[PDB]
């Protein structure tokens with residue numbers, strides 16, 4: 001059977017799988033107060049994509065479609081199409097289009113448009129509120145607030161490129177809520193075909209997160225964004241499709257400088273990592289450190305404490 | 307270690323010269339102009355060239371602190387690295403890794419966080435890479451923004467690119483004209499080499515995207531020589547090249563049939579046997595497959 005491996009890229013050489021930004025650091029913390037059920041960055045170790053996960057970071061939280069103005073406001077409805085501008089199919093057994101945001105928050109970026117007939121183009125600052133009742137990507141539409149009430153044309157290809165997140169109100173860092181899934185069909189129905197929630201089950205363990213800081217674009221947002229797998233690990237597993245020989249892949253995080261192991265962790269075959277630690281901890285690592293697969297173990301493997 | 311290329315399809319991959327997905331494959335003549343992109347440059351045995359780095363999401367991004375130019379809407383950014391540490395202008399690269407490698411006006415959002423209270427802000431901004439103030443190899447670039455007062459000094463600031471603009475139709479950007487990374491103060495140095503077919507009957511094969519347009523009538527075509535995922539693959543694998551040319555077959559797995567073959571040169575670009583401009587027609591599941599190392603005298607079947 002094809003030997004299983006993880007990439008040798010360093011943490012800072014990799015990308016967040018939940019927003020199109022680089023990874024910054026490794027983080028572990030308690031998750032008892034949350035349901036940890038992200039839909040992006042979800043892949044089994046033998047390369048089966050889950051949730052809304054697709055293969056490149058540059059498509060995450062992007063939207064494409066045609067737009068129509070909401071009444072006489074500055075808001076626009078986007079009728080979604082696929083990444084390559086073909087019709088979107090709501091009957092596919094996924095929660096929402098691949099790459100759809102998987103948290104409740106207000107994402108700011110630019111909404112851009114081209115007029116096919118003459119090549120004229122335009123761009124406006126725009127925000128999509130994923131907690132809005134008008135955030136219905138599974139049904140095929142989302143709503144943007146923009147800085148125009150007149151410049152976008154109907155029936156023309158329009159793209160949203162995400163940049164960061166915003167916040168409103170006296171309760172600082174109250175949004176985004178990275179561990180709260182949107183209602184992908186709004187009030188019309190419940191979420192479907194979700195990748196499952198993940199949680200540590202073994203005493204003394206926590207999830208290990210790959211952490212980034214989302215750019216902030218207004219107010220006082222919570223800019224923390226944790227993913228379960230780097231995007232490059234998703235791509236690696238998808239391509240290698242190495243069969244899992246047990247429930248858990250034991251990984252060692254190694255310093256090339258000394259050859260020494262810094263810590264070890266459990267990569268569960270369903271695609272998330274646990275470590276033996278309790279409480280919030282920004283891991284202290286050398287920048288050239290990397291993960292190495294060492295052996296196939298089970299869910300009850302007792303790790304060396306972090 | 308056996309050489310391989312990724313099995314990802316074209317639309318599963320990213321452009322190595324701007325943070326957007328690949329869309330299609332294109333071949334055409336390029337004798338009449340210089341093809342010398344600096345992003346998406348990597349040898350098959352994993353040596354990064356030009357300004358190439360490993361993530362698609364970092365391309366044409368800028369980070370640093372900003373200062374207003376006079377009381378105008380323009381801001382100078384003093385560049386730092388991806389993780390906010392020093393950029394060393396004496397490093398023998400053309401410019402910071404990920405710097406734009408075309409002359410054009412790139413529009414995006416300039417964002418900032420005030421460390422002390424976590425307040426944040428974002429403004430539409432454009433960087434003109436043909437401007438005399440585009441001097442990333444000196445450690446600074448200039449942005450035109452929609453504000454003349456909201457950005458603070460001494461605060462972490464990021465430019466996220468979105469697309470390109472034009473003034474005047476489709477005369478800019480110029481995707482095959484490198485900017486002057488040091489402006490008027492000096493010539494470009496340490497460039498990845500210009501590429502050209504050397505075998506009669508061959509043309510470059512380009513991995514093509516359409517940059518979003520943000521104003522005016524821009525030329526939105528953007529061609530790279532290698533997908534970003536291939537750069538990262540070669541970097542990681544570091545498989546030795548057994549000759550100067552790797553023969554690839556582009557395969558339809560729905561049928562096992564080869565659609566065309568091509569040459570992947572060790573120094574990191576692809577040629578096909580074709581004369582003229584051509585938009586390739588490929589199945590959605592098609593991918594490239596390394597088959598053998600060939601000598602210098604291999605004739606490709608017509609694409």
Ligand SMILES: C[C@@H]1O[C@@H](O[C@H]2[C@H](O[C@H]3[C@H](O)[C@@H](O)[C@@H](O)O[C@@H]3CO)O[C@H](CO)[C@H](O)[C@@H]2O)[C@@H](O)[C@H](O)[C@@H]1O
Nearest residue numbers: 167168169217218219220420424425426427428456457
């Ligand atoms: C925190 C600021 O965010 C952006 O400006 C926003 C502007 O924020 C105001 C605050 O709401 C207010 O409490 C006080 O602090 O003055 C701020 C500036 O007016 O609020 C408007 C809507 O009311 C928008 O949300 C703006 O984005 C940013 O531009 C500022 O630099 C601050 O970081």
Ligand SMILES: C[C@@H]1O[C@@H](O[C@H]2[C@H](O[C@H]3[C@H](O)[C@@H](O)[C@@H](O)O[C@@H]3CO)O[C@H](CO)[C@H](O)[C@@H]2O)[C@@H](O)[C@H](O)[C@@H]1O
Nearest residue numbers: 115119120121122123151152471472473520521522523
């Ligand atoms: C082509 C337009 O680009 C954006 O508008 C820009 C605006 O363009 C104007 C043209 O300059 C003018 O020739 C005429 O056609 O009206 C256009 C629209 O007002 O020019 C200003 C400053 O010169 C800005 O650059 C605008 O971005 C876009 O908003 C439009 O919808 C058109 O696509």
